[PDB]
Amino acid sequence: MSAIGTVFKEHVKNFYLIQRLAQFQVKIINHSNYLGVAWELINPVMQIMVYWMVFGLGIRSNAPIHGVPFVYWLLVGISMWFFINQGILEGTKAITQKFNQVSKMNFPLSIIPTYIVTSRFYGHLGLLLLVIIACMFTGIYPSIHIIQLLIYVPFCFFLTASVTLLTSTLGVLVRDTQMLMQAILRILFYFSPILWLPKNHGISGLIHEMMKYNPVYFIAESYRAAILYHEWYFMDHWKLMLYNFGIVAIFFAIGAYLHMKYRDQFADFL
């Protein structure tokens, strides 16, 4: 109960520091490129193209899902994946890479994964705005239900942050876990409604019931309901909302406890 409290107070107090360090990191990563921070948008946009040529043109022979073209379905479902993947992968190594520079000074160590995740949140916001703009050319225009994004866009961020707060700590204790992380992420890409929709009524029905436990399922479906389907998502699927809230709460609690427990002996392990 003390660890959760302490981490909460640190994150509440150092908001501006988190933002500014995230901006500095975004500046650092793209320093030598000629195009610069534009590569924060070009990199995912190209990847989607490949995922449309393979799974949309090759497989599916370009057929519609729920009366919507597959291109916009996939575009809305894919927007958060790059942010989630990159944020988790880099926040796992954040403390290991950045401990030495700030160890000599006094500076809260809980925010090291969060500011690196914030460095990746900006590209997600830009891509999501671009997606909403591009969805207009079909005839899909913004509605009232889009206000649901105010609940759904933050949640995704929170989820990612929580995971890093745990994994970063483990990354100091055992290095191998970092490698393991990559594999897990790949599974969460393919057992998700991003690229395909489970057929149900069969073994695919069991696959559907197993995919319902993936938080990526909830995030993708809620985004689609807010932008595409014109439907209040929380009316029919509030059980998923409660389950996901419980998942993020448990992740944050365990990560905070573990981080506070080993914080003083980080140099010995590192």
Partner 1 sequence: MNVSVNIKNVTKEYRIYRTNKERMKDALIPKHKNKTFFALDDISLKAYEGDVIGLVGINGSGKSTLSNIIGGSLSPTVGKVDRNGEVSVIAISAGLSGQLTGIENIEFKMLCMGFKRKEIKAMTPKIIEFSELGEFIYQPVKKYSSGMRAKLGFSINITVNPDILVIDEALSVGDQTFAQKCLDKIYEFKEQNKTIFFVSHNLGQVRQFCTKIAWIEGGKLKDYGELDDVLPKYEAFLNDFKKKSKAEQKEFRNKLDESRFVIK
What SS3 state is found at 73?
A: helix
Kindly tell me which of 172 and 226 has the beta carbon lying closer to its own copies.
Answer: 172
Helix (H) or strand (E) holding 165: helix 149-173
In 3D space, the residue among 243, 249, 181, 176 whose CA is nearest the CA of residue 214 turns out to be: 243
| Positions in the binding site for its own copies (CB under 8 A) | 32-35, 39, 43, 46-47, 50, 53-54, 58-59, 174-176, 179, 183, 186-187, 190, 196
Select from ligand A1AV9, partner 1, its own copies, none the partner in contact with residue 267, using the beta carbon and a kind-dependent cut-off of 5 to 8 Å.
Answer: partner 1
Q: For the CA atoms of 242, 243, 248, 252, what is the dihedral angle to 10 degrees? A: 100
Beta carbon of residue 264, minimum distance to ligand A1AV9 (angstroms, whole number): 44
Distances (CA, A) of 141 to 6, 82, 111, 184, 230: 44, 25, 38, 37, 10
Residues ≥6 apart with Cβ < 8 Å to 196: 55
Nearer CB in complex with partner 1: 1/28: 28
Among 45, 59, 125, 180, indicate the residue that binds ligand A1AV9 (CB under 6 A). Answer: 59
Size of the site for ligand A1AV9 (CB under 6 A): 14
Pick one of partner 1, ligand A1AV9, its own copies, none as the site partner of residue 17 (Cβ within 5 to 8 A by kind).
partner 1
Which lies closer to ligand A1AV9 via its Cβ, residue 80 or residue 94? Answer: 80
43 binds, among partner 1, its own copies, ligand A1AV9, none (CB under 5 to 8 A by kind): its own copies
Residue 257 CA to residue 235 CA, distance in Å, equals: 34
Give 229's DSSP letter. I
Contact at 8 Å (CB) between 149 and 125? no
Question: CB under 8 Å to 42, separation ≥6 — which residues?
Answer: 35
82/56 Cα distance (integer angstroms): 19
Q: How far is the CB of 94 from its own copies (least distance, A)?
A: 16
101 binding partner (options partner 1, its own copies, ligand A1AV9, none; Cβ < 5 to 8 Å by kind) = partner 1
12 binds partner 1 (CB under 8 A): no
Q: Where do contacts with ligand A1AV9 occur on this chain (CB under 6 A)? A: 53-55, 57-60, 190-191, 195-196, 199, 203, 207
Q: Where do contacts with partner 1 occur on this chain (CB under 8 A)? A: 16-17, 20-21, 24, 27-28, 31-34, 36, 100-107, 264-265, 267-268
